[PDB]
Amino acid sequence: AMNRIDKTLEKLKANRKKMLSPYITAGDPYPELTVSLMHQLVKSGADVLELGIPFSDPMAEGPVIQRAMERALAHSIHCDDVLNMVRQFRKTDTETPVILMGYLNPIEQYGYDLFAQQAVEAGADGTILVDLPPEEADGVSRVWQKHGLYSIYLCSPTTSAERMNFINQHANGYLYYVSLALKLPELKAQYLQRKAQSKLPLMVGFGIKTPEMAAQVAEFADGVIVGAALINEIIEAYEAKKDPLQASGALLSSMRQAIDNI
């Protein structure tokens, strides 16, 4: 089988088009908006969608994501609810790759094989498990492989030689680059250095707040991941009693254009 992620990245690579991937938390600010948001993001230029599974103990996330998860958990949105959203999305979008981002604990509670099976059946193409270090990922990788689910791994300026060895023979699709006062030339230097160690394309997954910054990064990077900025744009629209679809659409579309004109 050919994974949606590989199909999408091949087309982008052939056209010298940089990947743009928004993150949103499923269920935030309320469950009925999530699928509509997903479709809006695609309309506004998303190549890949990152959909977050809310978790009760996100000690690793920044304040913006933390609050998003709290809002989603107020509606009791869990793994099965997120898969139902993916199913609904897939009714009118079969091309766009969907990546599920979450913590390991709800999934292990759910059951690895059962989760992988249902996630693939629902129409998800891969997962980012934020608290699963590569050293611990062997059981998961084998189960994911069985169902054709892709594992998206994180790396950083300080990813060790052996960990990189762990990432290269189990990762598929692409890698997620994060640095943790970091400036653009340092980011560029460290990114290109890490990219040289990776078999896969490397997407920058932090610090992208504006169309300008998105373009500056896309100038050297394979792709860009936008999280906190979009979440903030959406919840600010909701709290101001304005259309969150308009707000998120305008933001992502301005990033799409900035990147493509860069």
Structural domains in the chain, sorted by start:
1-262 (3.20.20.70)
What is the Cα–Cα distance from 262 to 260, expressed in whole angstroms? Answer: 5
Number of residues that this document lists for the chain: 262
CA-nearest of 156, 149, 193 to 173 is 149
Residue type, 8: T
Taking the chain, what is the end-to-end CA distance rounded to the nearest angstrom?
34
Two structure tokens written together for 91: 């009714």
Burial class (CB in 10 A: 0-12, 13-18, 19+), 4: buried
What is the Cα–Cα distance from 115 to 95, expressed in whole angstroms? Answer: 22
Q: Is 129 left (phi over 0), alpha (psi -120 to 50) or beta?
A: beta
**What angle, 0 to 180 degrees and rounded to 10, lies between the N-to-C axes of helices 112-122 and 138-147?**
40
Catalytic-role residue among 10, 32, 61, 233:
61
Catalytic-role residue among 10, 50, 162, 212:
50
50 is catalytic: yes
- CA of residue 194 relative to chain centroid, distance: 19
What is the Cα–Cα distance from 102 to 143, expressed in whole angstroms? Answer: 17
What is the Cα–Cα distance from 174 to 145, expressed in whole angstroms? Answer: 15
61 is catalytic: yes
Q: Which residue do the tokens 């896969």 mark?
A: 200
Two structure tokens written together for 72: 């989603």
Residue 215, SS3 per DSSP: helix
